[PDB]
Structure formats: structure tokens, C-alpha cells
Amino acid sequence: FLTAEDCFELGKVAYTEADYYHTELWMEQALRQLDEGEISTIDKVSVLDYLSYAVYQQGDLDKALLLTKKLLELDPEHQRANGNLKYFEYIMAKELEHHHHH
């Protein structure tokens, strides 16, 4: 059994090597343990920051937007997550603009 902090550190190793799948495995494990109420010094916002980017790199845009929204619920002022949200909202508005014109 590994602490949430261990899982998070491992996910950062994966991320720094652009191993975005393993980043997702480790970060999701960390998030699960915190959600069950493990006492830990890592904060969910930073976990979600890495996780949202990793999921974006995998091409899973819906999931990346969801995670970005989860991050912003916890930290509404997060500058990059706000940036990423605006980007995802733009892409979605274009797709909906397309469906309305076709």
C-alpha cells in the first residue's frame, strides 16, 4: 500500500517523461485515496492539474473538461485551469455552431 503522496510523486515522474497514460493511472489512484479521506499533505487541485493535462494529451477532451471543472470548483482562481476551460468552451461552441448550420 502506497500513500497518496507516493502515487502523486510517481505520477509526476510519469508526466515529466510525457507518459500521459501512467500519469493518469497514478494521479487517479492518488485522487481515489484522498476521496476516501486519507490524511495527506498533497492537495487535490495539483493532482487534478496534472490529471487534466494528461487526459487532454490522450485526446479525451470531454474528460479533460470535466476534470478542469472539478479543479475550478476547488480553486476558482486557478489561472491555467481557467485558461484551459476557456479553450475547451471555445472548441465546444464551434462544434455546436457547426451542428446548427448543418
Add this chain to the structure above:
Amino acid sequence: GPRGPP
């Protein structure tokens, strides 16, 4: 573009 932790 989206920006992740640097």
C-alpha cells in the same frame, strides 16, 4: 492551446 504544469 491548453497549458499543463510546466
